[PDB]
């Protein structure tokens, strides 16, 4: 899915390759751009959770 809630900035190429959910994103494609994305908010979480893996803080 790679669901970013942003990129209103610059790229209609980003628009296409996002709205199609392009499973690939080329590096050479990236090198020709600046400020690709910043998922910057203060709202909620994404693809992660905390309070598990009992090994760490038991060691």
């Amino acid at each position: 899915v790679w669901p970013p809630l942003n990129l209103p900035g610059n790229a209609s190429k980003g628009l296409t390759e996002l709205m199609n959910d392009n499973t690939e994103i080329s590096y050479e494609f990236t090198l020709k751009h600046w400020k690709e994305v910043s998922l910057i908010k203060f709202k909620k979480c994404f693809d992660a959770d905390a309070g598990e893996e009992l090994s760490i803080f038991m060691k």
Binding site: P8, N10, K35
Partner: peptide, 25 residues
């Protein structure tokens, strides 16, 4: 002449993008 509307649109959105970059700090 009427192409200038989309020209200034994309240019000003690029400018707001630059403003975000400035917010980068």
């Amino acid at each position: 002449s009427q192409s200038l509307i989309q020209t200034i649109k994309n240019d000003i959105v690029g400018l707001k993008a630059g403003m975000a970059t400035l917010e980068g700090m």
